[PDB]
């Protein structure tokens, strides 16, 4: 596809906005705060392997990618025309919202004074993972796991086996080019399995960062003044195939730890996107 | 006026205004008495914990809230509006955290020796300048938290209904405006990125329980408030809104590790210019 | 006086001055004897703790204070004034903190072995250059602190009244000028961002109890002192004021974990030019 | 290709090539079986310790080695040479470290509860792109270390003599070239700054035992390979050499705290252009 | 003194490279790996004060400055060599990934885990100049009893015991870095009041278990030109290189004895001829 001039005139530039809620493990329903809804925004209690050969994590303990497909206004009455128009994503203002909520240290988590069961309710700490992507097609994913022996459920999550129809091999602990997918569904692709594929994603921009550890302080910045440029080295942004715009993210802040056997629950926060798009002539 | 035209020139077309906003960590400014509660001013009262998974009832004086002030600008009225161009802002008093001679939990607890443990832990710094109140989006750790009905503005104050599970993520129904000082808890109310077209805000968060506080201060740094089109916040009816919160962490007492939030005041010096509008 | 005109040119229109400011951590320069107290020079004396929630009286020699110097510039005299354009400044001696062979609390307390624990903890670095004394704003951890009435300048020295609860936040009445070396405690007195129009200051704070100290030093870094209008500090009566504090942390003794503050000296090389004024 | 001339223009004068290099932490790619050792691929085998000050014999499968690949470029032949202009490189799979549901040493060892401790500790990230093998300089912690003679390339492999005490600092005799994947230990062999005129390398090291691993990844970052004269690596005989190591830290088992190194693969996309040379 | 135009023509630019090995305490000889050579690149075991008034560190426990004076091509309106830029790198941080030795183990309860890697206080300084690096003395404790022979200390220069002012800035306590492996880094610091003809760059990170951090690349150039566009000028065609690169300590299994670790530093200096008057 040959990229030409920018389209000018009325309605040649648009802005669209969306929020993507986190997918930490507990689904949005049931809504009742006594039936599981109290865990929404969190995972359920992380369950551990029982031996070196028996690692069966429950689906509601595994954070998954958030995604949304936004439909843009149709540009072309006739797709057989020599020159067409496409929506081009120029820039995005993105923000992770709600870090202030982590200042709640008055709850019933493991307390900081364990002798007297006093102090404060230990705040969310530990491993953090923040990735976002904006593209004109689904985010391309590359599988890679800690342990190819992990017995993921066959129903309820998309894993390497879901794609290949075969058990994971040892190569899946490093880069196995066979283990590929596309982020085409919200709350289904575990982030411990599926990574942005650097060998593809020519029409997507992604930005990720990881900080590990168990008690690591979470850090976050937020402003409405920061614009992320989406143009490539040739001045071209993601081009929206069939007017579809794909937003993908995950924003893990760490864990809270309960007073019962140090059970951990992942915490995620929602992410806002405001994308500026312009019309581009293409051949 | 929504259409922004040329900058106004001539006598008194530019103005500077300055203000300090004191922190609102939980203890109110009065009683002033250093025996009857005033000794906690600049701090929260001792943080009280939930008694079970379903019983979390924090006291109002344990919850840091947003600071805000609405400043009146010179009378003006093709109309003119005041436009905020830039701000010099500074959090004052970090040197006071070098007081390690007090009666906090000591660093050597066996012998009651060492130094008085200085302020440490979770830190939160946000400031905003706009031409209308800061737009707020509610999001909480726990939708079951039983906040007081009087003395604080919470999600239930706005919706007239109990919080729902969606309030633990982004629920577009849970919105407010920062229109009162010392009333909106920072654990509930966040800058709304979907609004605030006429406000600039800047925030950062560092968590943990014993994290060293970090702060820089200088009178040489200017924050530009102009947007991508070169236009700053425009002051509706000549009102300028300043908002902030500056939490440095907690001190911990010698009695059951009781934690008190510490906040510090923020200085603002805002430069404004008159703008023609239609 | 107030109107700033062109730069002066010709013979001796530019000058450079250099000075070092030694730290003022609590022990004075005298007595010099290494067995009568002089061995603590560059350090505070042992930090003394409050005996109750209402009895906190730190000794003056345990409180770090601001360093300052007023330097006389060449005589002058429309009128001319000296203008400070830039400064090269450096904190010297961080390599001395690599002495881990002393008699501090050892890293293996089971066998009393390992190394002598190096200086760690809270760090505070501020410097200023101006044409008049640094303007100070008081703010304390605890308005009940019983600072000594002799040998130190505190809020009560200025107001002639006991501190009030507002002194734990921003109280505009509690102001002073840094006009004496080794007299203004850094846990009380902060650069005032509401004044200091003729001074530039730069500060940073890192808290905690065991935080690793960090420092960079080079002779290749120039700090520009010109304001947004291209005008540096103007030296009133040909006096240049240098102010600083550079706290590296504490060392800890083998006797009940007694802490001593450590400070380091700061070098200043200021470039000045003559300015025509009206 | 000593004298560098103009860039070649016209059809097929620019090319891009991509490759991934898998880590070489110690366990080879085969046997593939997940019950015969294949379950350790991407990791080292369990690190074995010295039995005394004079007996340090690490097993080859416990020692991370350099990854490398030689890529063949399009045939070319005033001659032409391929010139590497820039590279986009990324370390893939940091999200996999969010698996804390396995059978590692648990976070609560008192009750054997909590989560499976994630990978932590020392991290080492180096990559290089050149027109010939990466030049290596030997330097070790301990010249007395008894490395295996077969299966690894060590200083003794090169010199045919035991290591000397100078091998613990810079000994210019101890040099090699990175000409084989999975053979040169990263604890022995470092990029040689005195050579590598036709290679660019970029390395960083973070030590410690429980240090949190940190990684950024994006497809938007380009690394320029051009030198100060605007010339990138020139590919001798149309061969492009890629080299790397990406150690994330260790996992720790529930059996005597046995540590296993973890490595991650690195992606490279190199842009190359034809250059006239004489 | 008066700096004129750059010199043009054949051989008007030159490049010199050198490596400076660390001077952590154990000298290069004896070379034998059973007679002390096994500590080369390290200090010997740090020895502690026995009282508040008795602190006597052994010379081989004290890291000292590395330095080299390099001879430049003969020259002689006169000409001088001018140092324009330097590429510098600390080599061997990968060696700190050896956690298979006999250090204090990470699991001390069972004596298992890994051999604890080098951690703690780190100090990285380098300098390039046309004369010896000017040094300013400043110590933790003016009562420290350094050896009179084998190290250059404040007493070596002044001929008198240290005074309390030596714990802060005492202008009397000055020296020049004119010898390799002799000037303790805990005593001697770059003097910001001198060094008009040298550029130096230093950083310090303290603590006892702090993770060491290091970056290395052959793509980074440090400019040596001052604010007027003039680099260090080499007096008598001598170029001075100075450095120290301390990575932390290793800790043994015997009473937590600490040994400092240093790494070597590479320098590649670009110089040009300058007309001077
Ligand atoms: C209810 C029960 O026992 N269910 C069994 C399953 O165990 C549950 O598995 C999930 C993961 O799928 C979690 O680990 C559960 O732990 C929690 C949870 O619900 O998330 C952790 C919470 O911190 C805890 N809440 C409180 C307030 O203590 C919560 C409660 O204890 C229970 O929800 C109350 O009933 O538990 C864990 O319970 C198990 O996966 C399944 C398969 O064998 O068998 C179920 O019976
Ligand atoms: C005085 C009292 O017991 N009041 C009861 C309430 O308890 C108080 O609740 C507040 C929060 O609203 C704080 O947790 C109080 O703790 C402190 C405080 O006043 O902030 C913590 C201080 O560190 C402590 N100071 C010292 C020097 O010890 C202080 C004192 O102990 C008391 O203030 C002295 O009276 O307490 C806490 O006391 C409780 O919320 C209420 C139940 O509805 O009942 C009140 O009677
Ligand atoms: C000498 C004495 O006991 N004086 C009493 C005062 O106590 C002193 O107060 C100062 C603060 O003003 C310090 O805390 C002193 O602690 C030190 C010191 O001199 O700094 C701490 C040193 O680490 C310690 N040095 C050694 C090597 O042990 C030092 C020595 O113990 C003494 O200096 C030797 O005499 O002490 C502290 O001693 C006190 O303020 C006053 C009121 O009660 O009464 C004084 O008599
Ligand atoms: C699941 C488990 O315990 N895995 C161990 C593994 C097994 O104990 C063993 O392979 C079963 O036969 O042992 C590991 O440690 C190795 C030693 O057993 C071997 O002697 O030497 C190896 C180094 O060459 C290594 O130290 C292993 O196989 O890697 C450690 C592992 O956690
Ligand atoms: C392998 C080992 O234990 N190495 C020790 C070493 C030996 O104990 C000793 O050299 C063999 O006799 O001792 C070291 O400690 C030294 C002291 O023994 C010596 O008295 O003084 C030295 C300082 O000048 C040093 O402290 C050593 O030789 O460095 C420590 C080493 O780990």
Residue numbers in the entry:
A (entry chain D): 34 to 316
B (entry chain E), C (entry chain A), D (entry chain C): 33 to 109, 116 to 316
E (entry chain B): 34 to 109, 116 to 316
How did the manuscript describe this experimental structure?
Murine Polyomavirus (MuPyV) is a double-stranded DNA virus that can induce tumors in newborn animals. The differences among the three strains have been mapped to amino acid variations at two positions, 91 and 296, within the receptor-binding region of VP1.
The human milk hexasaccharide DSLNT is the glycan portion of the lacto-series ganglioside 3’-6’-isoLD1, which is overexpressed in the central nervous system. When bound to the PTA strain, the stem of DSLNT is moderately rearranged. In addition, there is no visible electron density for the GlcNAc O6 that is engaged in the [α-2,6]-branching as well as an increased B-Factor variance within the glycan. The reason for the sideward twist and the missing electron density for Neu5Acc observed in PTA is probably the electrostatic repulsion between the carboxyl groups of Neu5Acc and E91. While the charge of E91 is compensated by K186, as was hypothesized before, the two carboxylate groups would come within about 2 Å of one another if DSLNT bound to PTA in the same way as observed in RA. This hypothesis is confirmed by a PTA E91Q mutant that rescued binding of Neu5Acc. The DSLNT glycan binds similarly to all three strains, with the lowest overall affinity.
